[PDB]
């Protein structure tokens, strides 16, 4: 169509036929009025004397979702002042003039800039210069700078001695934005790229551009998850609809969620739902980009959840449509609160709001004012009192202010809670135990990742809130919680009304533990003003410290209560989490600081640092109170600090200069009660030069000086590789900084930091610790495990890392998980599932050099980005053939005896020997034979008989390949047997160690008795047990819930998805109840402590095996026995 008819080179210059050069160009930009670049050519191209003077319109775009409008008068607009006007290019709302070589050539603006919002209709007229007005809208994110031109030439217009000018439009676009918070419905199936980007040899096509623009991508087939779009005040979202779309109600004909106040209204519009919101591309008109964009105004502060649906062409067969439900979120900060997970507080009608940006226009200032929300409402309001809550998640250097009216003329006798907040600066601390247990069951969360809480997906609140409510009600783990009376069920005989809910809420506030804010978090600046200068308002203001030295996030409230005056109640919800662990500062004092990167010895008197954007610089010259030191009230030492303030005004030599003159609006943090340390967060600045600033302190009549190098290179450092050597910790290969895989602050120089660990193996007991958890929602979404081979063959293709791949690289090797079991009688075992350990056999054939890589750096967020760790492993040659029997031909290479089909195997062993055991493929392991060994048809523990302690037998009794070392001294000749049971009917895949239920049944059939067995007494120890590579028995409750929800088609046509979601419930029979079954002594506490307790026995296959054993007889049972003689 007229949109794209590019077939003419049309070589032309900017000045065209005019001799005017670029030195005398009349360069003036398009007018700016309410986000609209307009440079109308009215009256500026008419014939006139002193010409033709070239007129150039320069449109510089550096903001998202920008609208650009250009107007050129038509022929005959005014009598004989516009004849012979020409428009170049002829198609110029879409085709644009670009600059290659030294010429101007036509190109498609859609190709240059993706997501262009072409409007075919402008003011009910056609969008072209044939009308004289052209209109288009730019996308919100641009990857690279783009320049294109438009031409409106009037050189051929003349009137006797008058001649027309030449009009040029120059639109200059700079990169801006990162990504769109929304969905991208693609026309391709789900695929995972390799850890390396070297396979990008293909050209820079258009398909790659599409996938790198939205935070979430949804594929055409094998989808498991519906979209979840979350927005924020001042943020932008968007949706890329499928090419086969039939209808869409995601704009205008949309649907709110909140059933508590809804009047069963069918549809509502986003413009009506959110004031001052504007929707782009409502009609879905564009050449190729079927997209729509939304902008939420900054002043918006309300929280609100919404649904919508997308319908496709061609349905499934005739009328069955596989429509999609995608969720829209506009404002939900710190939503995991106890005002949603507790049913007793449901009846009270509340208004949930977020802390808006302060009027002072500071980017990191947040304010809630309850002056107009605590008013004594009209008595005619039958709804009653209202609850107003602010929720907000604070970070480093953030400033939060609570604004509250206490005027006796309007709000008499208002009460500020806590009552000790005014005097003791105390706030209501809350426990987060319930959130931890809930997150563990659904999101596979571990308590060691508490510091990264609130980053996990918000699915637990919406749309699946009823699941969380049922979890507390049903599971007995929450029955004995101290707040069980609050989240218990109501009754018809004991109902809860609006007044009753208010009374319990007042009781809830009065019973929560109170902790002083300053004492809880140090280096926190808190200021409380009982009465302001206006004699009306009570204000509480504080700023978050530059570093949060708290093990777990701090979760609290405070505010104002006007119940006595029949008014409303104000509550502010705040959370604080750690951002980064290290601060690049210089500590000149003897007492070292764990969070200071550079601690300077007393012999050194100067310290130099390099600074960059978003980085925190510290400077300490006074004492610090460690927990080993008794805190006392001692006046600060007379520290001679020059300047009196160190970092707001800094020394640039001998003269003092304020920091804002060097850095563009710098943020500095000090301590009111401590002279030092002082901190600065580097803001985005344009001062690319290497500027020097400094402070100084006098410690014990000795002057200490700190030097800071502020730099911002034209090109950031490409890579920063740090190599570390593995360390041996109790026969286990461990590497420091292995937790670097966790997300870190998106500092400029920390964006591309890669950590490599070097591992060398030359002895047995080779356990390789790898912290590389399975991919899960939230913090580990995009974890991929890949490996490559260096020696003896340099494999050019990257391959995924798994148990099968590792077996091919090194035969007869296993990956094992740490188990900390205390008593074998328990039905569940203590397992650390985050770490998986690689075990290699003694027979290392030759030098194998390979790397194991996890690339969680693919997980990226607005403020934090994931890690990347490389495990470089080298193994030394060995030639030890462990003694054993090769029952199957597959085990021939491991043992020196060709015992193929030799059911009875006897080995005569002597001290200083090593014996390994293997069962034939897919056969049931009768006994461990190293911890429980059959002696004279009796199951006996040879560990006590042979006085074995921390040898191979004890550490390898639960592996697929079990090894044992003969002790130096033995009391007498001893004979023990190791047996594998094979059932002739079927071949069994034993993926987990056999449980005692199956083993006892085999003992009865195989005539084995155990009545004198004695268990071990080892404490504070560890064992390896095999369980696949990633447990498939830990059913994903969320995946099952969405799969069942998808079957019901929650939104096809007026389907009311709210009722369908509520009816969606997971069956509790899928879970075995509380894992800590039976009686737990709980005395085995060490290091991490109470880890995840999961069942290891695969019940379904064991039940089949148990039934098979009972039905079978002796004739159908075959035995493979290893006999070991020790003399």
């Amino acid at each position, epitope marked *: 169509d007229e949109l794209d008819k590019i077939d003419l080179s049309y070589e032309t210059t*900017e000045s065209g036929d005019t001799a005017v*050069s670029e030195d005398s160009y009349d360069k003036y930009a398009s007018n700016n009025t309410n986000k609209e670049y307009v440079c109308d050519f009215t009256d500026q191209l008419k014939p006139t004397e002193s010409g033709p003077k070239v007129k150039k319109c320069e449109v510089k775009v550096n903001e998202p979702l920008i609208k650009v409008k250009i107007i050129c008068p038509l022929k005959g607009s005014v009598e004989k002042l516009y004849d012979n006007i020409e428009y170049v290019p002829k198609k110029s709302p879409y085709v644009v003039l670009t*600059k290659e070589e030294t010429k101007l050539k036509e190109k498609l603006l859609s190709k240059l800039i993706y997501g262009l919002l072409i409007s075919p209709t402008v003011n009910e007229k056609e969008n072209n210069f044939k009308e004289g007005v052209i209109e288009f809208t730019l996308p919100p994110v641009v990857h690279k*700078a783009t*320049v294109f031109y438009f031409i409106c030439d009037n050189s051929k217009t003349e009137d006797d001695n008058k001649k027309g000018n030449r009009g040029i439009v120059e639109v200059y676009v700079e990169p801006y934005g990162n990504k769109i918070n929304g969905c991208a419905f693609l026309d391709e199936d789900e695929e995972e790229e390799k850890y390396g980007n070297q396979i990008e040899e293909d050209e820079h096509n258009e398909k790659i551009k599409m996938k790198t623009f939205f935070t979430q991508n949804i594929y055409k087939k094998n989808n498991i998850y519906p979209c979840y779009m979350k927005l924020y005040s001042g943020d932008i979202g968007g949706i890329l609809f499928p090419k086969n779309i039939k209808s869409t109600t995601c704009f205008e004909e949309m649907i709110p969620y909140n059933k508590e106040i809804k009047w069963n209204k069918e549809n509502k519009s986003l413009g009506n739902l959110v004031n001052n919101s504007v929707v782009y591309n409502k009609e879905m008109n564009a050449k190729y980009f079927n997209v729509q964009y939304v902008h939420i105004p900054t002043s918006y502060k309300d929280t609100l959840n919404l649904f919508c649906s997308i319908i496709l062409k061609e349905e499934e067969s005739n009328l069955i449509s596989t429509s999609y439900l995608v969720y829209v979120s506009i404002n939900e900060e710190l939503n995991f609160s106890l005002f949603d997970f507790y049913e007793s507080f449901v009846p009270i009608k509340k208004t949930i709001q977020v802390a808006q940006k302060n009027v002072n226009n500071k980017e990191h200032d947040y304010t809630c004012d309850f002056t107009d929300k605590l008013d004594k409402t009209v008595p005619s309001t039958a709804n009653g009192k209202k609850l107003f809550i602010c929720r907000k998640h604070l970070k480093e250097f953030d400033t939060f202010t609570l604004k509250c009216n206490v005027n006796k003329t309007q709000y008499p006798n208002i009460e500020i809670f806590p009552k000790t907040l005014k005097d003791k600066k105390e706030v209501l601390k809350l426990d987060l135990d319930i959130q931890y247990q809930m997150f563990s069951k659904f999101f596979k969360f571990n308590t060691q990742n508490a510091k990264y809480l609130n980053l996990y997906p918000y699915y637990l609140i919406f749309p699946f809130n009823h699941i969380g409510k049922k979890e507390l009600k049903n599971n007995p783990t929450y029955k004995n919680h101290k707040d069980v009376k609050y989240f218990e069920q109501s009754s018809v005989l004991s109902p809860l009304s609006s007044a009753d809910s208010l009374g319990k809420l007042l009781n809830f506030l009065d019973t929560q533990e109170t902790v002083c804010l300053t004492e809880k978090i140090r280096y926190l600046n808190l200021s409380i003003n009982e009465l302001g200068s206006d004699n009306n308002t009570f204000s509480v203001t504080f700023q978050v410290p530059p570093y949060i030295d708290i093990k777990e996030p701090f979760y609290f409230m405070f505010g104002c209560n006007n119940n006595k005056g029949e008014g409303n109640i104000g509550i502010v919800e705040l959370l604080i989490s750690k951002q980064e662990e290290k601060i690049k500062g210089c500590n000149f004092h003897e007492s070292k600081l764990d969070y200071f990167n550079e601690n300077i010895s007393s012999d050194t008197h100067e310290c130099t640092l390099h600074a960059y954007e978003n980085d925190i610089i510290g400077f300490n010259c006074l004492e610090t109170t460690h927990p080993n030191e008794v805190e006392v009230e001692v006046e600060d030492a007379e520290i001679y600090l020059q300047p009196e303030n160190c970092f707001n005004n800094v020394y640039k030599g001998l003269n003092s200069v304020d920091i804002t003159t060097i850095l563009k609006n710098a943020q500095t943090y000090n301590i009111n009660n401590k002279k030092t340390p002082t901190f600065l967060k580097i803001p985005p600045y344009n001062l690319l030069e290497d500027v020097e600033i400094s402070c100084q302190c006098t410690i014990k009549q000795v002057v200490k000086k700190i030097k800071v190098i502020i730099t911002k290179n034209d090109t950031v450092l490409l890579k920063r590789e740090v190599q570390s050597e593995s360390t041996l910790d109790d026969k286990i290969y461990k590497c420091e900084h292995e937790n670097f895989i966790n997300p870190r602050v998106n500092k400029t120089f920390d964006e591309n930091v890669e950590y490599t660990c070097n591992i060398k193996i030359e002895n047995f007991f080779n356990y390789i610790q790898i912290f590389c958890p399975a991919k899960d929602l939230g913090i580990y979404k995009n974890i991929q495990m890949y490996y490559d081979i260096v020696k003896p063959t340099r494999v050019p293709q990257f391959k995924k890392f798994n148990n099968e791949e590792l077996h091919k690289l090194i035969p007869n090797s296993e990956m094992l998980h740490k188990t900390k079991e205390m008593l074998i009688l328990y039905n569940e075992e203590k397992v650390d599932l985050l770490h998986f350990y690689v075990f290699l056999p003694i027979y290392i054939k030759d030098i194998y050099e390979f790397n194991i890589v996890c690339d969680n750096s693919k997980t990226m967020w607005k403020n934090q980005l994931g890690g990347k760790v490389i495990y470089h492993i080298t193994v030394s040659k060995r030639e030890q053939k462990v003694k054993g029997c090769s029952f199957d031909n597959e085990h021939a290479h491991m043992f020196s005896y060709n015992k193929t089909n030799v059911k009875n195997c006897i080995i005569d062993a002597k001290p200083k020997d090593l014996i390994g055991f293997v069962c034939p493929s897919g056969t049931l392991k009768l006994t461990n034979c190293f911890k429980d060994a059959i002696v004279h048809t009796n199951l006996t523990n040879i560990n006590g008989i042979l006085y074995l302690k921390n040898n191979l037998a004890n550490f390898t009794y639960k592996h697929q390949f079990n090894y044992m070392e003969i002790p130096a001294l033995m009391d007498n000749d001893i004979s023990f047997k190791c047996i594998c049971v094979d059932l002739k009917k079927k071949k069994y895949n034993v993926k987990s160690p056999l449980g005692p239920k199956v083993l006892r049944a085999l003992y009865k059939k195989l005539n084995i008795k155990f009545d004198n067995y004695v268990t071990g007494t080892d404490q504070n120890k560890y064992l390896m047990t095999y369980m696949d590579l990633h447990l498939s028995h830990k059913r994903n409750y969320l995946k099952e819930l969405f799969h069942d929800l998808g079957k019901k088609k929650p939104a096809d046509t007026d389907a009311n998805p709210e009722s369908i979601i509520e009816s969606l419930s997971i069956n509790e029979s899928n879970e075995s109840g509380p894992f800590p079954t039976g009686d737990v002594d709980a005395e085995h506490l060490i290091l991490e402590g109470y880890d995840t307790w999961e069942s290891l026995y695969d019940e379904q296959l064991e039940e089949v095996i148990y039934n098979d054993i009972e039905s079978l007889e002796l004739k159908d049972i075959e035995q493979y026995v290893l006999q070991v003689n020790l003399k």
Partner: antibody
Amino acid sequence: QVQLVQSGAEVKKPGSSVKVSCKVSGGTFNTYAIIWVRQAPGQGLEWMGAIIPFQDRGQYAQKFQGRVTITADKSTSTAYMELSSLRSEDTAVYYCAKESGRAVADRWGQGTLVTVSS
Amino acid sequence: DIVMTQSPASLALSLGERATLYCRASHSISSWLAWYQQKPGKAPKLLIYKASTLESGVPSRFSGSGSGTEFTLTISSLQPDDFATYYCQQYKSYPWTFGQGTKLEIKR
């Protein structure tokens, strides 16, 4: 108003690298290309490459690869050139120019002289 | 690349005489040719920036013409400041080129 300024003449040993500094004063810098030409004395001029400052991706002559390098820095409005692995016959006068919107190089610099004899 | 077969090699003339320069091309090209003036020790100065147009400040005795495979630059009369070495450059394609150059000798 527009004027072009180039560095002084320099002598370098064979196998070394020589850098030529170019600055564009007046007009505007981003949206016009800057071209480079060299000429051995007594013979015709030779074209080498050009760059448009807003995009760091420059292009060079088909005969000259690798050794010639042209870069632009909009912060200082400069168009430095780096030439590496010098060899005999490189002793020539080097010239810089930019196009004024009329599709042709309209302004030329003062020039630079390079010597490569051992 | 586009070849600049500029002819002749040198021209010996006196004051007031007529000079006619030529610059042919390897293949037919529509315009986009410029002529550069350069005395010994001067920077190449642009005098004609298109097929026939002239730069501001260039004297009126200069006159360009020709298109396609052949181009002609004619100087009606030489003045004391008109003797230099002249070059012709094509820019229809990105790989620009320059000719061997023409010499303007004073007197005979």
